[PDB]
């Protein structure tokens, strides 16, 4: 049997055969505590280390996930499509909940310590679990250790009063704790604590980026030369600079919740103490909605974990030199457009104007809006066929995609390479059409996930039920190789050459069935939001 | 010897051998009167027909050109570069002047042939058809070529805003030449029902303006074809540009009247006063308009020009001619030439100044702040935003696009829209002179020597460039397109790389270079800025 001794006790994993000939087996350690349960007085408090246990602890089944409610209005626009498309399956992964949810899962392959890829999930900061992301194939195919983590979500993980009463960022601190646990225990599993790659998609991608800006991710016990906890980062369709990356009005929504559950909101210490006497179910189940493209509960600017606005930090180059790799998908903004399209696959010029105008209002309140609505309306029309209704959606979809994902990604990519971090950029332009998605839709938000995890190798799963072709399998194998090569050496080419990114040339890898390296991804539309729109104010 | 009988008498031309083996000889009839001298009481009056002569009139030397002053200064930005580059040679063509200058030149090769009437023009102020030798074009193409001299500057376009001086005398002269041609060219072996008019620059403007005038309607030969001429080619010139037509004619008529001592309350007295003065005195007065506008030119008289060409075009008020338009890569050379430093680049400093003054001259604030920023963004290549060699290339494009390209596309669009067989091109080659920078591309008027077939003869006093073997080949191709178009209204058919018909939807055009290809939507990104965005602002 597979036994492993850790600094808190011995644990037993479980061997797992994969449904493919090319793939060797993996031992998976499910439900490994990396922190003390954040219950009672430790709610709204930094994570403490886990209690040691005397005997052998079985790590063979998922632990209950962190409190969340996806069955009872959720922001489809932030959430991956494969998530919202089959919530029924996703729900079975989230049924068993508990405030005691700080657990991570290890996937170990089968003559030196292996790289460790720690996955950080995330949709809107409100929900999800690392359990959804099976790390078996990636570990086996890549010959690396893969870890998935569960961190505090929503209220419990990010509620803040704007005071020392509740400073917030408990979720990010949990991630820090999981990374420290990993740093100081993964070696016992045959992992290399000095080649740890952190990677995540969506809000998970945001979390990855936010950590690189935090001084809590500085320093590791093993090396005086390498002062990072983790050494590399991959942020997939997520950044720290988007409108919904961090919560800017945390005290507002903390008051709201406290009110809704009947707690006095005058004194902040009294407010917090009251919330702590209430079930997590009651706090989670309250209806708290922010602005359309903003969040209520998430990462906050506390002057500690996150010392300042991520924008300012990046500009001042306030981050350790990590090997970075970030990118976006062709059509992230599917769910922004999906409700608008009619029986034929197009949107009228009428609906177009409404959508673009409301977009301007939500993200750019008039101080001057008139000018802006026209500049954008112009920029996101293809005059080649200005009356085509099928082309109007593709470009409207591009508006959301560019502003919410692409421009933030490029800005991030630019500033990292600018300050000396080996940066790599990509554009994911393939996917596997499900019977739940339109036939005209391209690579949407989160569609790159199943390729990174190697799902096509195993074939359709309950979570990813698409009929993966042979092209899907090959593309997946290519992706996993880039990722894992990057994990092994900080170079996606060293275990089509993926060239290093730089602000001048802005070379990136266009990922498709025919992967090529291009240059200046959508710079025309990008520089609009980074150079023009700001100067108009 | 070559004798020809016309409705006004017999005339003797002169045979001319061309300096190329492939070219047969041509008989050229130089100094043929097509109208009575507009002298004395016929100054500021429509052109009357020429007097008949009993004997043989020798047409073997150029007649004196229309009054003009380039020696005493010259709007370099409107004028072709080959013009301003060697004024010494150009001057020899303009030395001998006379108000009696309504003469045209015939070039006959060796059924009835097509007739190509060339309409010269720089700023409406100067020039002559004599500069444009039509020998090679006629010989190579096997068509008759005509060059015309029409009234210029004050004498040709002065208007008081009254019936006292209605203006457009120059345009009426062109009409007179065309009527003369229609009713006499048959005697030379020409086809009065296959007359093509073509011109570059202001000449191009003149071509376009004629298509909007009802005076070019009706011919004596056919009841089905309602046009005097049947086809039109407008090279780097339109009726929609800022300097195509004079909108403040009365202002500048008074200015002149003032300088010569004729400023009178009553316009009929004013005109009568100007009529008692030498043409030299009127031509030599210093009258300069706004930076990108004209003082003396085509005017909106409600007769010859029934309304603003823009309105006319939009309402489709024009006969359906076979149309052909295009521009050169870098028309706006002379806009930028003064700015470049020893290195072939312009600083970010000078750039902002040049662009801002451009905004002020063409778009005086009534809102300018927004506009200068929108433009500054659109005309910078963010690929390398700091490159000084690239800053000039894009600033040059600003002028080029606004003054030439956008007016051309708009014209091209509205013509094809209302049913005229339209054709579009972009001229991307030239022959670098020791007078032009080595970094300059196809500038204003650089397509002329290729249209006239000069590379076939080799360097001339006017076109002294060392034409290569490729130049000769490209010229043959250009002349073939032009002459095919004259013959059949189709640049692909001589009788009775395929250049595809243009249309507002597909907007196919011929990219003319050493490797001529058909592309689509020429600089539509930059065009639609001026046609769709800035207006709505
Ligand atoms: C732990 O699990 C293994 C297999 O998963 C099993 O053999 C063992 O008996 C379990 N231990 C306990 C104490 O239940
Ligand atoms: C025209 O030229 C002929 C010879 O070609 C000559 O006899 C005649 O005198 C000339 N005409 C005039 C008006 O000089």
Residue numbers in the entry:
A (entry chain A): 52 to 123, 125 to 162, 187 to 443, 445 to 572, 590 to 631
B (entry chain B): 52 to 123, 125 to 162, 188 to 443, 445 to 574, 590 to 630
Task: Give the published text.
Simultaneously, the insertion point for SSB in NL1 is in close proximity to the Site I interface (Koehnke et al., 2010), suggesting that presence of SSB might affect MDGA binding. Next, we determined the crystal structure of human NL1 containing SSB (hNL1(+B)) at 2.55 Å. The nine-residue SSB (NRWSNSTKG), inserted between Gly295 and Leu305, was clearly visible in the electron density; the N-linked glycan at Asn300, a modulator of the NL-NRX interaction (Chih et al., 2006, Comoletti et al., 2003), was, however, not fully resolved due to conformational flexibility. Superposition of NL1(+B) and NL1-MDGA1 (0.308 Å RMSD over 434 NL1 Cα positions) or NL1-NRX1 (0.306 Å RMSD over 428 NL1 Cα positions) structures revealed that SSB is spatially immediately adjacent to both Site I interfaces. We found, using SPR, that insertion of SSB weakened the NL1-MDGA1-2 interaction ∼7-fold, while reducing the NL1-β-NRX1(±4) interaction less than 2-fold. Taken together, our results suggest that, despite the proximity of SSB to the Site I interface, its presence does not eliminate the ability of MDGA to block NL-NRX signaling. Rather, SSB provides a way to fine-tune the NL1-MDGA1-2 interaction at excitatory synapses.
Members of the presynaptic neurexin (NRX) and postsynaptic neuroligin (NL) transmembrane protein families form the axis of a signaling pathway that is crucial for the formation and function of excitatory and inhibitory synapses throughout the brain. MDGA proteins bind NLs and control their function and interaction with NRXs via unknown mechanisms. MDGA proteins are attached to the postsynaptic membrane via a C-terminal GPI anchor, and their large (∼900 amino acids) extracellular domain consists of six immunoglobulin-like domains (Ig1-6), a fibronectin type III-like (FnIII7) domain, and a memprin, A5, mu (MAM8) domain.
